[PDB]
Scaffold this active site. Structure first.
Site, short mmCIF file in Angstrom:
data_model
loop_
_atom_site.label_atom_id
_atom_site.label_comp_id
_atom_site.label_asym_id
_atom_site.label_seq_id
_atom_site.Cartn_x
_atom_site.Cartn_y
_atom_site.Cartn_z
N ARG A 128 0.78 -1.23 0.00
CA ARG A 128 0.00 0.00 0.00
C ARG A 128 0.82 1.29 0.00
NH1 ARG A 128 -2.86 -3.03 3.65
NH2 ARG A 128 -4.88 -3.90 3.00
N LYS A 150 3.59 11.63 -11.09
CA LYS A 150 2.79 10.78 -11.97
C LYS A 150 3.53 9.51 -12.37
CE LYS A 150 -0.74 13.39 -14.53
NZ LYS A 150 -1.07 13.87 -15.88
N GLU A 192 9.98 17.87 -24.61
CA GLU A 192 9.33 18.25 -23.36
C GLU A 192 9.78 19.63 -22.91
OE1 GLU A 192 6.90 16.46 -22.90
OE2 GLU A 192 7.31 14.63 -21.74
N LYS A 248 7.31 22.99 -14.20
CA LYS A 248 6.47 21.84 -13.92
C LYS A 248 6.16 21.81 -12.43
CE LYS A 248 5.68 16.95 -14.55
NZ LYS A 248 5.97 15.75 -15.37
N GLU A 258 -4.28 16.78 -11.16
CA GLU A 258 -4.87 17.21 -12.42
C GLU A 258 -6.38 17.50 -12.34
OE1 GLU A 258 -4.07 14.43 -15.68
OE2 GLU A 258 -3.82 16.16 -17.01
N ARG A 262 -2.92 21.29 -14.14
CA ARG A 262 -2.01 20.25 -14.63
C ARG A 262 -2.31 19.70 -16.04
NH1 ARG A 262 1.39 15.92 -11.00
NH2 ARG A 262 2.43 14.90 -12.78
N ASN A 266 0.03 18.65 -20.50
CA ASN A 266 -0.34 17.63 -21.47
C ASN A 266 -0.56 18.22 -22.87
OD1 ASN A 266 -2.52 14.73 -21.49
ND2 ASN A 266 -0.34 14.83 -20.94
N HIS A 269 0.10 16.07 -26.06
CA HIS A 269 -0.05 14.68 -25.65
C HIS A 269 -1.38 14.03 -26.01
CE1 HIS A 269 3.65 15.55 -23.64
NE2 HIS A 269 3.70 14.35 -23.07
N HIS A 273 -0.19 11.02 -27.60
CA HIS A 273 -0.38 9.70 -27.03
C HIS A 273 -1.14 8.80 -27.99
CE1 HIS A 273 0.35 10.86 -22.55
NE2 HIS A 273 1.37 10.17 -23.04
N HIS A 285 8.72 8.65 -27.22
CA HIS A 285 7.67 9.53 -26.70
C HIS A 285 7.86 10.99 -27.11
CE1 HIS A 285 4.63 11.19 -24.16
NE2 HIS A 285 5.48 11.75 -23.31
#
Ligand SMILES: NC(=O)c1ccc[n+]([C@@H]2O[C@H](COP(=O)([O-])OP(=O)(O)OC[C@H]3O[C@@H](n4cnc5c(N)ncnc54)[C@H](O)[C@@H]3O)[C@@H](O)[C@H]2O)c1
Ligand SMILES: NC(=O)c1ccc[n+]([C@@H]2O[C@H](COP(=O)([O-])OP(=O)(O)OC[C@H]3O[C@@H](n4cnc5c(N)ncnc54)[C@H](O)[C@@H]3O)[C@@H](O)[C@H]2O)c1
Ligand SMILES: O=C(O)[C@]1(O)C[C@H](CP(=O)(O)O)[C@@H](O)[C@H](O)C1
Ligand SMILES: O=C(O)[C@]1(O)C[C@H](CP(=O)(O)O)[C@@H](O)[C@H](O)C1
Ligand SMILES: [Cl-]
Ligand SMILES: [Cl-]
Ligand SMILES: [Cl-]
Ligand SMILES: [Cl-]
Ligand SMILES: [Zn+2]
Ligand SMILES: [Zn+2]
Lengths: 390, 390
Positions: A128, A150, A192, A248, A258, A262, A266, A269, A273, A285
């Site tokens: 956990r 993330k 990026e 960032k 997000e 946030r 992206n 992306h 993506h 990427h």
């Protein structure tokens, strides 16, 4: 000195040269007191940097008593390492130790985004939750992937569909890792950096435009036995990196989970993506993100938000860095042996975008270089998305 | 009226009769506004309660426009459902919808601890996180398993080794579900109720002792077409349940991520889980916990913390409820076809206890009924643990 940056109310980020060598092990034992440390990395990176680290660790754990233990895990290269299978193996391995790794464990991620996401996730669910530190070894990881908290893994249906947001206790940006970073990986990461500037500072964007040549040539220029790949342009490089890392931190700190702000991180992306899911692992990427930013800029202009001038300007800066600016790109062809991206396959993948509010797709729209249309993703109709995917 | 309890600064718990019928669907649509609701349950429970719920849902979603959708997922019975395999299938299923389930999704867990833990976990990692509500259908789930936010799955090496702490947005304790709860499941759940009292209130413990007969007989007594299994003893039952729920809320609220106080809720689970890992699925969790509490009480007394009198008193109250009080128990034998628990296999499994600080095992020690030795787990040497495992 070591430049430090605070994120989510805390000085977890520390950047400088040679941190891996003389700092990490020391810092881990003091700030991250534990009896069990687990270092995760792959075969390439590992055989180069873990040996000297084991030593710096042993040197520091001689202080403590009973002395803590560092367990090392090494596995296969690529995005293939980001799967349920792989995450499970790291876990089964940790539990099977003698004694097993408890909740006191301190996982150390030493790699790019793959080793970072995988490791960060493994820690978020291990019993956990256990701490971990990020040790980015790729430009893309130093500027983006190791910061934010993330983490995730990929499933046959898309990028980072399963994962969690688990903040690392420490992030070590050791620029010195760039000394061996392959040329492509460097250009790959460069996407990026340009992205972060395009949604934050017009100045910073220009600065990236101007540095294009100098940097790109220092990256291709062959390096001799006793010099640094970044002689001459050492600070310039530290400025470009810090700029992206800092922003960032600003964006993540204000909207960690997000909920709004946030989304901006992206940019490129949404389409990126969607592309990536189809072209990976042949296309990195950062490579898919460049093409994504251009397609998203085009859409912004298509919707009247962005300016033709800004759009083509984005393109220039990307190509300036060796990043692809169109799904038609030559190499993107020779590499993508066969594979193609119909608007249908793409649109399908964009249906799985983690920003979509219900069925309403959401994409980040730029109104001008360094200025978002909103402080969140903008809902964009499907027909409009289709046109800019010509 | 509907008894409500606040947990972690919030009125997420709501208990009363027939909530499933006329409340949940209504509450979900208002408080948990979403466009996609996913109901997870198994074949037994499902064919009995989902039909009427689909209706109450449709009735309420007629209000909204566009109307939201309820997706239903049904799978196999037992603790077998708590695995990486299973968690993955629920996820693959959700993503494969049309459209896929986004971050707006609201997962509904309708089952005992298995459906609760599984579902809670699936939500904690789904696209890095989606809301979910707990709908406990078993006594053990109403008193313990659906509250706290603790979720997980099991691996071949032990109980709940991988998981996360994801708080549910709503918890619906519909006592009416107990009307069909099999006798064993009821006694099984009863262990958690006695546990919670043994670490909180001596009064509440006594109250449980006195109610033993009345309750246990209402549970065995056959019920006619038009009456309630708990006629006569309706409030008594609501008091016993609320008591345990409320105290867990108190303990969880003060130490959500088990940094200290939350260890207490793990009384009887150190030896209990060690047992369980070996006797499951033949031996239920509550059953393994009873034996665990007795073994832990014995150890407490062995160490001079607990009193012989209190120890045997624990035993009596457990046996009073039909819970087993020794690994030697007859049925525990006939059910555990073959299987046995050497001190070695057990000690091994206790090495994997999520409380162990490093290699130092930690167990909850009671100094008297309703009073912990410390407000955390006590470090107990291995030799001492071994003796009480005779
Ligand atoms: N979750 C996040 O915060 C986040 C953010 C950005 C991107 N990403 C993810 O990051 C992943 C890609 O990241 P990446 O480019 O770092 O990939 P990666 O981890 O696969 O690393 C790329 C390559 O670099 C090599 N390498 C590592 N460091 C090196 C060094 N010092 N010198 C020489 N070779 C070295 C590795 O062997 C590997 O072949 C994608 O899966 C993407 O979705 C995630
Ligand atoms: N994470 C936590 O907070 C937590 C806390 C306590 C226990 N647990 C876990 O809970 C699990 C066991 O929980 P459980 O006993 O609820 O088990 P379970 O979910 O397997 O349910 C037991 C049985 O009850 C049946 N059932 C469900 N509701 C019914 C109803 N209304 N009437 C008739 N039959 C019904 C089911 O078909 C099943 O066969 C263990 O895996 C344990 O580790 C977890
Ligand atoms: O918020 C972030 O950190 C990101 O949006 C996270 C994404 C990955 P995600 O789309 O899976 O969240 C990353 O690729 C991007 O560069 C920055
Ligand atoms: O804190 C809790 O909620 C528990 O300790 C959680 C455990 C499961 P865990 O030992 O896997 O945390 C549960 O069985 C116990 O009844 C209560
Ligand atoms: Cl934890
Ligand atoms: Cl190269
Ligand atoms: Cl999320
Ligand atoms: Cl029965
Ligand atoms: Zn990215
Ligand atoms: Zn339990």
């Amino acid at each position: 000195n070591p430049t430090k940056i605070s994120i989510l109310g805390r000085e977890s980020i520390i950047a400088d040269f040679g941190l891996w060598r003389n700092y990490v092990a020391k810092d881990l034992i003091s700030d991250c007191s534990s009896t069990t440390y687990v270092l995760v990395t792959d075969t390439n990176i590992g055989s180069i940097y873990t040996p000297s680290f084991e030593e710096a660790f042993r040197k520091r754990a001689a202080e403590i008593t009973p002395s803590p233990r560092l367990l090392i895990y090494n596995r296969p290269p690529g995005e293939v390492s980001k799967s349920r299978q792989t995450k499970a193996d790291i876990e089964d391995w940790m539990l099977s130790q003698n004694p097993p790794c408890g909740r006191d464990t301190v996982v150390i991620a030493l790699g790019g985004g793959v080793i970072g996401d995988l490791t960060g996730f493994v820690a978020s669910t291990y019993m956990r939750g256990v701490r971990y530190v990020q040790v980015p070894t790729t430009l893309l990881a130093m500027v983006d992937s190791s910061i934010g908290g993330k983490t995730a893994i990929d499933t046959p249906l898309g990028k980072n569909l399963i994962g969690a947001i688990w903040q690392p206790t420490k992030i070590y940006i050791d620029l010195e890792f760039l000394e061996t970073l392959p040329v492509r990986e460097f250009i790959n990461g460069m996407a990026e950096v340009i992205k972060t500037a395009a949604i934050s500072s017009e100045e910073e964007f220009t600065a990236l435009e101007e540095n294009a040549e100098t940097i790109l040539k220092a990256v291709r220029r062959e390096v001799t036995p006793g010099e640094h790949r970044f002689e001459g342009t050492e600070e310039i490089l530290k400025a470009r990196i810090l700029a992206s890392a800092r922003h960032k931190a600003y964006v993540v700190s204000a909207d960690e989970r997000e909920g709004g702000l946030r989304n901006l991180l992206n940019w490129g992306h949404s389409i990126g993506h969607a592309i990536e899911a189809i072209l990976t692992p042949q296309i990195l990427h950062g490579e898919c993100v460049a093409i994504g930013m251009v397609k998203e800029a085009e859409l912004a202009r298509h919707l009247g938000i962005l300016k033709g001038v800004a759009v083509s300007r984005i393109v220039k800066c990307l190509a300036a860095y060796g990043l692809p600016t169109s799904l038609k790109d030559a190499r993107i062809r020779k590499l993508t042996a066969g594979k193609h991206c119909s608007v249908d396959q793409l649109m399908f993948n964009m249906a799985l975008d983690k920003k979509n509010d219900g069925p309403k797709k959401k994409i980040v729209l730029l109104s001008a270089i360094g200025t978002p249309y909103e402080t969140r993703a903008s809902v964009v109709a499907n027909e409009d998305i289709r046109v800019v995917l010509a």
